[PDB]
Ligand binder design. Structure first.
Ligand SMILES: COc1ccc2cc3[n+](cc2c1OC)CCc1cc2c(cc1-3)OCO2
Length: 121
């Protein structure tokens, strides 16, 4: 759920999910349209696609458990949905940490109208 996702993000990047990653670019948070603006936005795009692979799952509200082993995120065994949701979120948290150097404040609260084009999953 967003509670676990939020905590991963803070742990990885030291930034709070709201508001650093909930209104960023074309894909982070609510949105989903056009071309991702930068690496961080691509992480959100792939994250949206990952959830999109799980029709019959409720990734926003379904809670999973994860632990840290040697600093590494390890998803603990739950239902099938919980496992797969945790793996999507884990990948996004790492992707954010990997692209932290290029995170730009310029893309915070980005315009909807400037999210143009198309990109399939
Ligand atoms: C139902 O309300 C919603 C709806 C959608 C929400 C989406 C997100 N958050 C709260 C939401 C929320 O609650 C305030 C919090 C953090 C976050 C980090 C993210 C992200 C999406 C979100 O994509 C990449 O990184």
């Amino acid at each position: 759920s967003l509670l676990e996702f939020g905590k991963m993000i803070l742990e990885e990047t030291g930034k709070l999910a709201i508001p650093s990653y909930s209104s960023y670019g074309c894909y982070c948070g609510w949105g989903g349209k056009g071309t991702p603006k930068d690496a961080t936005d691509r992480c959100c795009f792939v994250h949206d696609c990952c959830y999109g692979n799980l029709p019959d799952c409720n990734p926003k509200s379904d809670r999973y458990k994860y632990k840290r082993v040697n600093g590494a995120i390890v998803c603990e065994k739950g239902t099938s949905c919980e496992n797969r949701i945790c793996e999507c979120d884990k990948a996004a948290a790492i992707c954010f940490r990997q692209n932290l150097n290029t995170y730009s404040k310029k893309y915070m609260l980005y315009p909807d109208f400037l999210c143009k084009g198309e990109l399939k999953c």
